[PDB]
From a paper:
For direct comparison, we crystallized and determined the 2.5 Å resolution structure of wild‐type HsAGO2 bound to miR‐122 side‐by‐side with the mutant complex. In contrast to the HsAGO2 + At‐loop mutant, there is no contiguous electron density corresponding to the center of the wild‐type HsAGO2 PIWI loop (residues 603–606 are disordered), and no interactions between the PIWI loop and L2 loop are observed. In animal AGOs, the affinity of the seed region for targets is quite high, with dissociation constants typically in the subnanomolar range (Wee et al, 2012; Salomon et al, 2015; Jouravleva et al, 2022). Superposition of wild‐type HsAGO2 (gray) and the HsAGO2 + At‐loop mutant (colored) crystal structures reveals nearly identical structures. Notably, target affinities of HsAGO2 + At‐loop varied over 1,000‐fold between the 2–8 target and the 2–21 target. This dynamic range is two orders of magnitude greater than the ninefold difference observed for the corresponding target affinities of wild‐type HsAGO2.
Numbering used by the authors: 23 to 122, 124 to 273, 276 to 602, 606 to 817, 839 to 859
RNA sequence: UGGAGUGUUU
């Protein structure tokens, strides 16, 4: 029910000086005051609500508030550093906004609470059990009140349109540069977390031009013909749900709920005439008579806004995309690459950008922050980290080599798989054009693939038993039926694909869920031109797909948790961007290495973070563990990815109980110790080497193994940061781990070391990964269920029995 | 789809 306290502080690893983007806050012990604001209408946007409260405090300067500068959260929560003359008596007041008839707003104020700040600092010293959230969020409201007025808020972030501060991405989208801000508690002090942030937005422009950027028109006049049944639906997918503003009447905002089939010249709506009889009138005709405006593009469709039942249709030429709309739809591959290139900063560069943000923010001169008597240190918090020692990786073959990770990396030169697979029969299914992928390309691809295979301990015996061409979606299952039907011991089928093709999704649906054949796809370009490293990495994926063991942790280097049988679980849920369902995935370890993992997946409610069917999922994973090892886990280690702090209790409640439920349903008195660990990549905590000498790579990031659990972590609970991976490009994201439950009384060191070692068991690469393999595999499983496409959906994701005990998701 | 890591009133 309640997260355990920090047991101790880790001492493993060599110290290292670090700086964090957490800026110390000096907070007075005063007693701040809380008021509620019932604003009528109660639906108004936060943005208007802030204007209301703005003029409301200006208008009633002498009556109510005098000279005090209160802070407003945008909804109905006002704070003051001094008591107001309200005196707990509800006071109904009036507010008038300079409108277009002007607007009138009814506002009422009342004292509701007496937030104590001294009650926070003691909680920061472990004095109290928990930390009061209402006081933390009260400070947050103070620190972001001014940013929320002068910038565009987006979650905890702030953006604007200064000097462009954006790069184009195509398709009507651009990436804006802003900054994140949050108030967070730590031991003995409150911290202000500041970071740069960049998110994708829809360019503000006329919809006509949006229709050009979407689709692909160098100029609208090139399409003087009603949009095809294809251009129309693509455009519908992009603009649906976006805000638009009128540019002809008297601006005015609307939400697009659909795009009409007909053009404006023929799209009609019922118009009631003076006499009371209703008649059908075209949008073009109505814009002629009413607004005296001949549509320039009457052959184009209309934007239906408002309720889908009502018939509010707007021509494209009178609408603009409203500025400041965060793009929440999936970005095209080319769009994300542009965003990645545009937003990647080295560690030293990002550190400076944060320092610049602090200078321009100048919190120590913000009137509202000064009003509440708060101070924000200008220097980054100093932290001592620890570089945990990596584990040794044991290989096999004849040289059974022991690799030693260096800066989060190692290779397989002069090393072979731990238990490699001997492969005799295997087919090639080249779905790419023979012209680009000629028989010479296949022969040399094969030739060099077998050379790399035998060098790694996975010898590919002889030539492929089969090698033919094909194309089309419907050509897979018939050919796959044949392949299994006519080849004894068919182990692996290599598939060649051009670029982004729908053959991949169905090649997996058939090989994973229907016939159950291990498949390995590979792009055409990686056939015409082959590299040893690419061939080597390719071999990692296919050895495990056939039950191999690429390597294992050096057994004697493991933490004592491996004394008794133990199962490691990873859990993740991937959500769509209304009818699409969420996909829950839970994987479990099936040996003591731990290397092999069995997967469970479920389709559940749209955007439900809670794993609904977790108990059933855990149950079958425990059975498979018993069937694979003939042991019953004495401990269950549960790595749960992607849960914000605001959902710890909800997930802890349902999912911790579900795990317990699966144990006792198997066996009344089976009570293994559970450890529940939330793993989070989606945060803005950033660590930088204080000494240049400790920087790693061209990015200058902290080294793999860097661990922090002292000054920026929870004042009482069991949490820590572990940057287990090597920063390649940009600035490393240190993974955060929060222990919500622990029956096994883990020490700080053993859990940190265990977590670190688990990041070295990821079989797809000879590198330490940013999260433990179980959590990573869980993400891959759910991703694979997406390519697999309520009763029918569950079976589209249900996996074939033969491929129910292998690592098909690799 | 070799891989990791980097940003997310009509
Ligand atoms: Mg997730």
């Amino acid at each position: 029910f309640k997260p355990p306290p920090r047991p101790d502080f880790g001492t493993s690893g060599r110290t290292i000086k670090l700086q964090a983007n957490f800026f110390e806050m000096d907070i007075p012990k005063i007693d701040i005051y809380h008021y509620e604001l019932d604003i009528k209408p109660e639906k108004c946007p936060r943005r208007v609500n802030r204007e209301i409260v703005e003029h409301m405090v200006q208008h009633f300067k002498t009556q109510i508030f005098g000279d005090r500068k209160p802070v407003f959260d945008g909804r109905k929560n006002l704070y003051t550093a001094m008591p107001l003359p309200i005196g707990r008596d509800k006071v109904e007041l009036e507010v008038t906004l300079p409108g277009e008839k002007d607007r009138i707003f009814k506002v009422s104020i009342k004292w509701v609470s007496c937030v104590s700040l001294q009650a926070l600092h003691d909680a920061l010293s472990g004095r109290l059990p928990s930390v009061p959230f209402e006081t933390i969020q009260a400070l947050d409201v103070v620190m972001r009140h001014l940013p929320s007025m002068r910038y565009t808020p987006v979650g905890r972030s702030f953006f604007t349109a200064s000097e462009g501060c954006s790069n184009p991405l195509g398709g009507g989208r651009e990436v804006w540069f802003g900054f994140h801000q949050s108030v967070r508690p730590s031991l003995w002090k409150m911290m202000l977390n500041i970071d740069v942030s960049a998110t994708a937005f829809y360019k503000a422009q006329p919809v006509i031009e949006f229709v050009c950027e979407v689709l692909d028109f160098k100029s609208i006049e090139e399409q003087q013909k009603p949009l095809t049944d294809s251009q129309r639906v693509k455009f519908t997918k992009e603009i649906k749900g976006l805000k638009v503003e009128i540019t002809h009447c008297g601006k005015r905002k609307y939400r697009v709920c659909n795009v009409t089939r007909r053009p404006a010249s023929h799209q009609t709506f019922p118009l009631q005439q003076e006499s009371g009889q209703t008649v059908e009138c075209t949008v073009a005709q109505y814009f002629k008579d009413r607004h005296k405006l001949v549509l320039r593009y009457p052959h184009l469709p209309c934007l239906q806004v408002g309720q889908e039942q009502k018939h509010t249709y707007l021509p494209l030429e009178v609408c603009n995309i409203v500025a400041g709309q965060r793009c929440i739809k999936k970005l095209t591959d080319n769009q994300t690459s542009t965003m990645i290139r545009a937003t990647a900063r080295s560690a030293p560069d990002r550190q400076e950008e944060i320092s610049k943000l602090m200078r321009s923010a100048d919190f120590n001169t913000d009137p509202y922050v000064r009003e509440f008597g708060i101070m924000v240190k200008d220097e980054m918090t100093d932290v001592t980290g620890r570089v945990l020692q990596p584990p040794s990786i044991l290989y096999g073959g004849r040289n059974k080599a022991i690799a030693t990770p260096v800066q989060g990396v190692w290779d397989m030169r002069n090393k072979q798989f731990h238990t490699g697979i001997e492969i005799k029969v295997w087919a090639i299914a080249c779905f790419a054009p023979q012209r680009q992928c000629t028989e010479v390309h296949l022969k040399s691809f094969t030739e060099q693939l077998r050379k790399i295979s035998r060098d790694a301990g996975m010898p590919i015996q002889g030539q492929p038993c089969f090698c033919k061409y094909a194309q089309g979606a419907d050509s897979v299952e018939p050919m796959f039926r044949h392949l299994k039907n006519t080849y004894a011991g068919l182990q692996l089928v290599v598939v060649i694909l051009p670029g982004k093709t729908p053959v991949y999704a169905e090649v997996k649906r058939v090989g994973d869920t229907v016939l159950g054949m291990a498949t390995q796809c590979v792009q055409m370009k990686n056939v015409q031109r082959t590299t040893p490293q690419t061939l080597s990495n390719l071999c990692l994926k296919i050895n495990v797909k056939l039950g191999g063991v690429n390597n294992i942790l050096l057994p004697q280097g493991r933490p004592p948790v491996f004394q008794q049988p133990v199962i490691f679980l990873g859990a993740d849920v991937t959500h769509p961007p209304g009818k699409k369902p969420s996909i829950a995935a839970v994987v479990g370890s099936m040996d003591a290495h731990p290397n092999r993992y069995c997967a469970t997946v479920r389709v559940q409610q749209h955007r439900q973070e809670i794993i609904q069917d977790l108990a059933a999922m855990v149950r079958e994973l425990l059975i498979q563990f018993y069937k694979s090892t003939r042991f019953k886990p004495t401990r269950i280690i549960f790595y749960r990815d992607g849960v914000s702090e605001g959902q710890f209790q909800q997930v802890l409640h349902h999912e911790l109980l579900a795990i317990r439920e699966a144990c006792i349903k198997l066996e009344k008195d089976y009570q293994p110790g559970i450890t529940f660990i939330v793993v989070q990549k989606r945060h803005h905590t950033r660590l930088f080497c204080t000494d240049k000498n400790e920087r790693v790579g061209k990015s200058g990031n902290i080294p793999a193994g860097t661990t922090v659990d002292t000054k920026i972590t929870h004042p009482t609970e069991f949490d820590f940061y572990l940057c287990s991976h090597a920063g390649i490009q940009g600035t490393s994201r240190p993974s955060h781990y929060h222990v919500l439950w622990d029956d096994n009384r883990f020490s700080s060191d053993e859990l940190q070391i265990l977590t670190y070692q688990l990041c070295h068991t990821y079989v797809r690469c000879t590198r330490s990964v940013s999260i433990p393999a179980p959590a990573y595999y869980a993400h891959l499983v759910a991703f694979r269920a997406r390519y697999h496409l309520h009763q029918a959906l569950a079976k589209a994701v249900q996996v074939h029995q033969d491929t129910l005990r292998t690592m098909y998701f690799a």
